[PDB]
Write a protein that binds this ligand. Structure first.
Ligand code: CLA
Ligand code: CLA
Ligand code: CLA
Ligand code: CLA
Ligand code: CLA
Ligand code: CLA
Ligand SMILES: CCCCCCCCCCCCCCCCCC(=O)OC[C@H](CO[C@@H]1O[C@H](CO)[C@H](O)[C@H](O)[C@H]1O)OC(=O)CCCCCCCCCCCCCCCCC
Ligand SMILES: CCCCCCCCCCCCCCCC(=O)OC[C@H](COP(=O)(O)OC[C@@H](O)CO)OC(=O)CCCCCCCCCCCCCCC
Ligand SMILES: CC1=C[C@H](O)CC(C)(C)[C@H]1/C=C/C(C)=C/C=C/C(C)=C/C=C/C=C(C)/C=C/C=C(C)/C=C/C1=C(C)C[C@H](O)CC1(C)C
Ligand SMILES: CC1=C(/C=C/C(C)=C/C=C/C(C)=C/C=C/C=C(C)/C=C/C=C(C)/C=C/C2=C(C)CCCC2(C)C)C(C)(C)CCC1
Ligand SMILES: CC1=C(C/C=C(\C)CCC[C@H](C)CCC[C@H](C)CCCC(C)C)C(=O)c2ccccc2C1=O
Ligand code: SF4
Lengths: 73, 203, 218, 41, 742, 81
């Protein structure tokens, strides 16, 4: 029960990690400062500047749906 | 200049200034000048420990075969019982060699700094070269401090070449004990009887 | 000017300055266009010399204890074929003063003091007669061509003083050299097929040649 | 050794030499002191 | 014109180029500036075409890399013979192999892992090996571990020779470009010198060493009293007592009385009833025939002796009215591009390894190979995975040839230009046959699952429901069983036991082989196999054909091979690259090869592998459930993935518990793959920006800037963990189940 | 064995193929067959004493086709007659 409660705390903490990261890097970040002017659910920003796949806040929600599924699983 | 491989060109880092220099560096590990001075210092204490090693392996076992002394074999000499346990014989030696080799560690790094006795400052070592400390404790006869440099280089060359024969000998005594399970004086007398057959291929 | 088994690729580099320059190179091995480490025109004539002289010491040496045993000049214990003489201890082992594994270490110690000196004269001629070697390093200097040193030791009768005489005699060395390599290769295949020494193979063929050839005997 | 020791000081070699020493140490701790669940000191 | 072109000392053997890591690439020679430099350091390490534009130095790099690979394989073989010599029970297994399991790995007793040294038999503790080395050494005639140690030190000698040759052919005498472009000589010396003389030398070993020792091993003679292999060569009467045809002594070979060699050169067929492995009189006649046939085929091409073929003259005379100027320039393709030859060689080596897998479960070449079921499952599974990886790499280097070595000026109106000219037709008709195969195999499985779920067993595709009997396979198996009587006279028995010629071979109370039935279940799973192979061909051939350009991106060849995308334009151009098609074909190779080895494991655990009791009754491992449960996905999940996984999960506390640990850790690596596959770079880059902020706060910022992995690199890491985790899952489940029930 | 059928075939298979390679009936080193099976002359570079162009390669090549064909005729007639 101790070990799976730390699994639960891992799940809530990592889902909160992706979701707080999506909510607070929603307007912009150091990779792309104008994320607010591209809307919420934009796909990417192109292969330039290293690569900007899943840069949007909707994509952090997308990656944290897997983490809520793993958490509640 | 005598060289180990008379057709080969001698290496640039081995200029013949070192004692016992015969240009033998096929792997070239002494190419760095800072690492060459460490390796010459490594070869000096290797030579003198092996000559002290060869006088405790081949000298008393020859006296054991001749019946002069009843000392055990060199392989089973550490297994014998003494007044001090062999586990705590090491930490006495480690403490005594933290002053012997640790003060030797400073001479390789900083030359001419540990040549003064700390208890009595009037006592000092009459040595100017790294690896050859001199003084009364190490050169009580004064043969290593000569005015001429050609005789001094040959005497240091005589020290190195006597050393590297023993580094072949103590390594030779290790593998002979692993292969024949017999003392190297007894391996010599077995080889002195029939040298055609009593060899490494006698199995 | 005898020329056999030649091609226009082969005569581009075999111009006749060699002793055994008969033009025989169908594969194109002494080509100077792709000269490398061991396939090059500087090592390959010198490789045929050392393989020739070891085969002339080999073809004569593998038949001499068998010929001398039939005429009665050596004891019959040493009058044995070459393969059952400690070389291959499966087909036969003869007891010398040492076992052949110790004798091999004595071999490569003396070959290592003889062929390392022969090696470094090829890479640079005359560079070995400078370091001290038993007071005899002056005679071991060699010529520019490393196959023929011709010093006071390797030419100690001085036979072949004239340049025209020595060059024509070099042709007789390689032609006797090449015949000895085919003899030792001939000695090797007869030792496996017939299983008996080469002088017995000559004596068996000289009695009944139509019943003791290669086709009848395996 | 101006460049051989530079290669020996690279990131994969020094990770192999440290973790070879690190796993070499922790295995030899786990031989003379095995099954260690509670630190007694 | 074929002759040796080398040149002396191209690069000096120095360690100053070892110290600079990115010396081969101009971009990496400036040193690191981000953490992506480390990944492009390894990504461009072997990519020799991206280093230099000179094909001569590229070919020298490839030749010395081949020698380094040969050194690595000889070090590996040295290890496996040293493990047989010192850390095995090969003499104990060789005394009696029907009760002692093959084991050649001893672990150290350190942390509780000494339970992995299990009771394999013969008074020995160790990891039970499944690599088949013990049966291979029994087929080689190896009797003692001194011979294994001699082969290990000889392999170490050859590994030092390959290292010396790799140094020699890059730093002392490296060949020039026209030496590597002599492909006629290379084929002449690979067909005759390598595969012909290699088969001839192994035929000589299997005449003198393998055959009499393995004949004495069939007689129950103890291997410590069996005469040594050179005693048959020396004492030929000892060789003649086992085969009287040796008493004639090489005179029937040169007088064409080869039928007098019928004592030891036979066309028997089938398996040895003593051991369960092929006959070595047949394996020696096989090697003598493929040697007298590869040496004939090695005298085909024109080097410099007048006779032969210029293969450009073979190609340029092969032109047809449906193609026009076909086959022209393909010699210039295959002699100026290493990737095109790599594509062909990788396709042949992968397909050949798949041939090896089928021709070893079916015709087991080694004594007691078939009855040791762990060896058979592991050898088939290993060669299927290697073959699938090599055919995906074949399509990879085909695509790299298109993006980096395909010159359109030299290829006009040939076969390759016209294949590019109708690539929409190829990919669309392949797409149609893939969708048709997907419905007509997997929807048939879904139909069987649905009517078995709905309580309609008569509405299914069973052997009792609507039958789908493979009449072509069931006829070709009868044609291969009823062959010796009329179409292949001179055969004592038939080629394989799995054809239908009877001969229930029982070795050690365990079934070696018998007639393999083919029913509705085999039809369904073979159509699954054809479907999955076709879809893997579809992604891979789409990446080869659309490597140059597409309707979407007409300048795709300028973007390269390992580029992620063009961008979010044209609706989104994600995974347009040919690399991404190799990346997806790796998953489809997982799907294809995993269903192949699953069909293999269930098909022979249900219909082949088992035991024979008295009065000729055969009890299989999972008795007869392939014909009824392998037609539904619930049977595959239930009677294969659940019933046979009841030995990988309760192996804990035993010697097979490392298979349980790697089963679970393989699930871990697979779910770790789903982190890299499903995510993208920019999220991880901004998360790393937050971590870099936390490092800036505590002044522990590295000067090498932490970066997220690249999109090509993130897909590469995801597919590497997906293949590693899933393949290790199947490896652990297979090697726990078939060791436990074997 | 001299008058046996194995010797008479293998002599005649080797002799007729060497006759074909010398008298311009078979492909050799100095004459090439095209796709139309027409003998066209070439310079392979190999020099022997034959005025026709027969070299040391062809006496090994036609000896081999004297032997590859000749083995098959002997063992073909051994299984049949
Ligand atoms: C952060 C996680 C974590 C923690 C707290 C520990 C801590 C411990 N493990 Mg470990 N272990 C872990 C992860 C962890 N493990 C993982 C990831 C593995 C798999 C590789 C193992 C497998 C492992 C081995 C095989 C051994 C330990 C042992 C130990 C002990 C080390 C004692 C010593 O001096 O060394 C200690 C109780 C040893 C021990 O004493 O067991 C109690 C021992 O047997 N562990
Ligand atoms: C009859 C001569 C002959 C034979 C036997 C081979 C054999 C081989 N070649 Mg080679 N080759 C030759 C001549 C020959 N070559 C010619 C004439 C050309 C020039 C046009 C090439 C150019 C060529 C290249 C460019 C490469 C090879 C490679 C290969 C290797 C195949 C890969 C492998 O794993 O095989 C199985 C491997 C083995 C069984 C190992 C055997 C190694 C031993 C020491 C023999 C090799 C030395 C030599 C070729 C033959 C000496 C015979 C000796 C036993 C008496 C193998 C060593 C490939 C390779 O791996 O490069 C290193 C490679 O791509 N070949
Ligand atoms: C490359 C492989 C190879 C090699 C090295 C050998 C080696 C040998 N064979 Mg041969 N042999 C081989 C292939 C091989 N054979 C094959 C495949 C067959 C079937 C035709 C045989 C069947 C055979 C017989 C029938 C005999 C030999 C014999 C010989 C020996 C003398 C001939 C010689 O060295 O030349 C020698 C030990 C003779 C011998 O001494 O037997 C040991 C002998 O009588 N061979
Ligand atoms: C005969 C074999 C062969 C040949 C010669 C090559 C040669 C090459 N490949 Mg490859 N290829 C092949 C077969 C082969 N491959 C197969 C088997 C596949 C399918 C996977 C492909 C797919 C393919 C693609 C997708 C691409 C290449 C490319 C490359 C090039 C350089 C790659 C590099 O620098 O290494 C880099 C090496 C590594 C990163 C090592 C990682 C090894 C794997 C991926 C992970 C570890 C696996 C290991 C078994 C698990 C251990 C885990 C443990 C440590 C915990 C080079 C031309 C690349 C290129 O640009 O070509 C020009 C590239 O884009 N290959
Ligand atoms: C179980 C999971 C799953 C399923 C259902 C699919 C389904 C599909 N894949 Mg696949 N694939 C998967 C996982 C999956 N994939 C994953 C893991 C990857 C990522 C690597 C891929 C990526 C992918 C590639 C890259 C390719 C495919 C393609 C296809 C098609 C194959 C043709 C076929 O079978 O048509 C029949 C369709 C089915 C069997 C799906 C079930 C439909 C049922 C049977 C019909 C009844 C339902 C009813 C109408 C409802 C009312 C099909 C649409 C290929 C394609 O599109 O070209 C052919 C293609 O090239 N796959
Ligand atoms: C007098 C001349 C003559 C005669 C009548 C024969 C007759 C024979 N030869 Mg022969 N042969 C000859 C010339 C001749 N040969 C020459 C000139 C060559 C040299 C190239 C050969 C080389 C040779 C080969 C390579 C083979 C024969 C075989 C055979 C048998 C034919 C089997 C068959 O029908 O396969 C019918 C086959 C098929 C319908 C399909 C085969 C498809 C393959 C397996 C793929 C028969 C005993 C075979 C045999 O087993 O010998 C006993 C065989 O292996 N011969
Ligand atoms: C046998 C394995 C050792 C082969 C070493 C070959 C080689 O690189 O040394 C041959 C090297 C070539 O010397 C190179 O010279 C360069 C300047 O031109 C740089 O100084 C390189 O660092 C140095 O390696 O010779 C040496 O000086 C030996 C030292 C390096 C070898 C260390 C072995 C560990
Ligand atoms: C597999 C066999 C499929 C039959 C194909 C076959 O018989 O090819 C016949 C035809 C041969 O064309 P040519 O006569 O131009 O071929 C001369 C050859 O030497 C090719 O250079 O090939 C094609 O045109 C390809 C058509 C594939 C058609 C789609 C098939 C899938
Ligand atoms: C230089 C070079 C050059 C390049 O670099 C390359 C190379 C090759 C690398 C090189 C070389 C090298 C080498 C040869 C090495 C080796 C060494 C040695 C052997 C040492 C020993 C060394 C040795 C040593 C010190 C020794 C020591 C010893 C001792 C202490 C002993 C002791 C003892 C005694 C008394 C007796 C008793 O009862 C016991 C005991 C206790 C036991
Ligand atoms: C000088 C002269 C002459 C002569 C010539 C001649 C006579 C020739 C000969 C030649 C010959 C006569 C040749 C032959 C050759 C042979 C060969 C080249 C062989 C090869 C072989 C092989 C190829 C192999 C074999 C086989 C087979 C086939 C099968 C299986 C088995 C075996 C492997 C064994 C005359 C008189 C005209 C005139 C004057 C001058
Ligand atoms: C996790 C993840 C990352 C981040 C991955 C990173 C940063 C790799 C981490 C590698 C190691 C763990 C860091 C480097 C380790 C150093 C060698 C230092 C050693 C420290 C310990 C390992 C000893 C991506 O960049 C990415 C990109 C595209 C799609 C998916 C993903 C993705 O899922
Ligand atoms: S690969 Fe990345 S950059 Fe390209 S379209 Fe997809 S998400 Fe956008």
């Amino acid at each position: 029960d101790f070990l799976v409660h730390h699994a639960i705390a891992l799940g809530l903490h990592t889902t909160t990690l992706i979701l707080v990261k999506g909510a607070l890097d929603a307007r912009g970040s150091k990779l792309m400062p104008d994320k607010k002017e591209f809307g919420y659910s934009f796909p990417c920003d192109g292969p330039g500047r290293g690569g900007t796949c899943d840069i949007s806040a909707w994509d952090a929600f997308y990656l944290a749906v897997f983490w809520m599924l793993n958490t509640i699983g | 200049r005598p060289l180990w491989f008379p057709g080969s060109q001698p290496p640039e880092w081995l200029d013949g200034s070192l004692p016992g220099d015969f240009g033998f560096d096929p792997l070239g590990l002494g190419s760095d000048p800072e690492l060459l001075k460490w390796f010459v210092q490594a070869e000096l204490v290797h030579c003198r420990w092996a000559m002290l090693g060869a006088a405790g392996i081949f000298i008393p076992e020859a006296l054991t075969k001749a019946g002069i002394l009843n000392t055990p074999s060199w392989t089973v000499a550490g297994d014998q019982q003494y007044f001090t346990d062999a586990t705590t014989l090491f930490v006495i030696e480690i403490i005594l060699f933290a002053w012997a080799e640790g003060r030797r560690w400073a001479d390789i790094i900083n030359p001419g700094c540990v040549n003064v006795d700390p208890v009595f400052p009037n006592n000092k070592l009459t040595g100017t070269d790294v690896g050859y400390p001199g003084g009364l404790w190490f050169d009580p006869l004064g043969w290593g401090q000569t005015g001429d440099a050609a005789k001094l280089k040959d005497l240091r060359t005589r020290e190195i070449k006597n050393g590297r024969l023993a580094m072949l000998a103590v390594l030779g005594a290790v593998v002979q004990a692993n292969y024949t399970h017999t003392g190297p004086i007894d391996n010599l007398l077995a080889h002195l009887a029939d040298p055609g057959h009593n060899t490494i291929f006698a199995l | 000017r005898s020329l056999i088994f030649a091609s226009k690729q082969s005569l581009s580099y075999l111009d006749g300055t060699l002793p055994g320059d008969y033009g025989f190179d169908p594969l194109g091995l002494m080509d100077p266009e792709g000269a490398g480490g061991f396939i090059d025109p500087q090592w390959l004539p010198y490789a045929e010399i050392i393989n020739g002289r070891f085969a002339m010491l080999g073809a004569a040496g593998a038949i001499a204890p068998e010929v001398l045993g039939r005429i009665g000049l050596i004891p019959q214990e040493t009058a044995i074929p070459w393969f059952q003489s400690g070389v291959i201890p499966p087909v036969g082992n003869y007891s010398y003063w040492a076992d052949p594994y110790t004798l091999f270490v004595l071999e490569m110690a003396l070959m290592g003091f003889a062929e390392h000196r022969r090696a470094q004269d090829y890479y640079k001629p005359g560079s070995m007669g400078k370091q001290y070697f038993l007071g005899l390093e002056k005679f071991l200097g060699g010529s520019g061509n490393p196959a023929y040193p011709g010093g006071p030791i390797f030419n100690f009768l001085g036979f072949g003083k004239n340049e025209k005489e020595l060059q024509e005699l070099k042709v007789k060395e390689v032609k006797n050299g090449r015949l000895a390599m085919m003899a030792v290769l001939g000695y090797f295949t007869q030792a496996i097929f017939t299983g008996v020494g080469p002088f017995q193979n000559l004596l068996d063929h000289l009695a009944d040649p139509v019943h003791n050839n290669v086709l009848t005997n395996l | 050794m101006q460049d051989v020791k530079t290669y020996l000081s690279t990131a994969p070699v020094l990770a192999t030499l440290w973790f070879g020493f690190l796993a070499g140490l922790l295995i030899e701790i786990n031989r003379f002191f095995p099954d260690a669940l509670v630190l007694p000191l | 014109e074929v002759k040796i072109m080398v040149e002396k000392d191209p690069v000096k053997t120095s360690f100053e180029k070892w110290a600079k890591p990115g010396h081969f690439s101009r971009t990496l020679a400036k040193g690191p500036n981000t953490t992506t430099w480390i990944w492009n350091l390894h990504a461009d390490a072997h990519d020799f075409d991206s280093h230099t534009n000179d094909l001569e130095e590229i070919s020298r790099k490839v030749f010395s890399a081949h020698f380094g690979q040969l050194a690595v394989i000889f070090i590996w073989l040295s290890g496996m013979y040293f493990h047989g010599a010192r850390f095995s029970n090969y003499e104990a297994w060789l005394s009696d192999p029907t009760h002692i399991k093959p084991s050649a790995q001893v672990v150290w007793p350190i942390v509780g892992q000494k339970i992995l040294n299990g009771d394999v038999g013969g008074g020995f503790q160790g990891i039970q090996i499944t690599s088949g080395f013990f049966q291979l050494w029994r087929a080689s005639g190896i009797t003692s571990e001194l011979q294994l140690y001699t082969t290990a030190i000889g392999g170490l000698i050859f590994a030092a020779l390959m290292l010396f040759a790799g140094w020699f052919h890059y730093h002392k005498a490296a060949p020039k470009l026209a030496w590597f472009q002599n492909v006629e000589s290379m084929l002449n010396h690979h067909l005759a010198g390598l595969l012909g003389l290699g088969s001839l030398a192994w035929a000589g070993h299997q005449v003198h060493v393998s055959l009499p020792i393995n004949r004495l091993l069939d007689a129950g003679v103890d291997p410590k009293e069996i005469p040594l292999p050179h005693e048959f060569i020396l004492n030929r009467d000892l060789l003649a007592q086992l085969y009287p045809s040796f008493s004639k002594g090489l005179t029937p070979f040169f007088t064409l009385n080869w039928s007098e060699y019928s004592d030891f050169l036979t066309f028997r067929g089938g398996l040895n009833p003593v051991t369960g492995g092929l006959w070595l009189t047949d394996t020696a006649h096989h090697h003598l025939a493929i040697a007298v046939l590869f040496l004939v085929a090695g005298h085909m091409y024109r080097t410099n002796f007048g006779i032969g073929h210029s293969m450009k003259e073979i190609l340029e005379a092969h032109k047809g009215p449906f193609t026009g100027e076909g086959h022209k320039g393909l010699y210039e393709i295959l002699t100026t591009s290493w990737h095109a030859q790599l594509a062909i060689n990788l396709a042949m080596l992968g397909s050949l390894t798949i041939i090896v897998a089928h021709h070893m479960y079916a015709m087991p070449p080694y004594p007691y190979l078939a009855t040791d079921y762990a060896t058979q499952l592991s050898l088939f599974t290993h060669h299927m995975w290697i073959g699938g990886f090599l055919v995906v790499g074949a399509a990879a280097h085909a695509a790299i040839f298109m993006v980096r070595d395909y010159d359109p000026t030299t290829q006009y109106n040939n076969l390759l230009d016209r294949v590019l000219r109708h690539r929409d037709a190829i990919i669309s008709h392949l797409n149609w046959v893939c969708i048709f195969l997907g419905f007509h195999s997997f929807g048939l499985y879904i139909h069987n699952d649905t009517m078995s779920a709905l309580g309609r067993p008569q509405d299914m595709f069973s052997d009792t429901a609507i039958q789908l009997q493979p009449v072509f396979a069931q006829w070709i198996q009868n044609t291969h069983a009823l062959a010796p009587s009329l179409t292949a006279p001179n055969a004592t028995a038939s080629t394989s036991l799995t054809w239908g010629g009877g001969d229930l071979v029982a070795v050690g109370g365990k079934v070696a082989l018998l007639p393999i039935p083919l029913g509705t279940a085999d039809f369904l799973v073979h159509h699954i196999h054809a479907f999955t192979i076709h879809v893997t061909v579809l992604i891979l051939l789409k990446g080869v054909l659309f490597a140059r350009s597409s309707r979407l991106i007409p300048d795709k060849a300028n973007l390269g091979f390992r580029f992620p995308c063009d961008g979010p334009g044209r609706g989104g151009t994600c995974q347009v690259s040919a690399w991404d098609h190799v990346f997806l074909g790796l998953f489809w190779m997982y799907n294809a090869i995993s269903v192949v080895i699953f069909h293999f494991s269930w098909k022979m655990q249900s219909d082949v592998w088992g035991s024979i009791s008295d009065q000729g009754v055969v009890t299989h491992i999972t008795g007869g459930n392939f014909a009824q449960s392998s037609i539904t996905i619930n049977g595959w999940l239930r009677d294969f993935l659940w019933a046979q996984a009841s030995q990988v999960i309760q192996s804990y506390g035993s010697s097979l518990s490392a298979y349980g640990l790697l089963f679970l850790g393989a699930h871990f690596v697979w779910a770790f793959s789903l982190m890299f596959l499903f995510s993208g770079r920019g999220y991880w880059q901004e998360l790393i920006e937050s971590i870099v902020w936390a490092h800036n706060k505590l002044k522990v910022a590295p000067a090498i800037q932490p970066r997220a992995l690249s999109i090509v690199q993130g897909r590469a890491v995801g597919v590497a963990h997906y293949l590693l985790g899933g393949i290790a899952t199947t490896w652990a489940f297979f090697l726990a189940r078939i060791i436990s029930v074997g | 064995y001299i008058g046996s059928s194995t010797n008479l075939i293998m002599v005649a298979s080797t002799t007729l193929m060497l006759f074909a390679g010398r008298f311009g009936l078979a492909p050799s080193a100095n004459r090439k067959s095209t796709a139309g099976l027409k003998l066209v002359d070439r310079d392979s570079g190999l020099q022997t004493g034959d005025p026709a162009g027969f070299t040391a390669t062809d006496t090994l090549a036609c000896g081999a086709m004297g032997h590859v064909i000749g083995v098959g005729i002997v063992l073909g007639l051994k299984a049949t007659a």
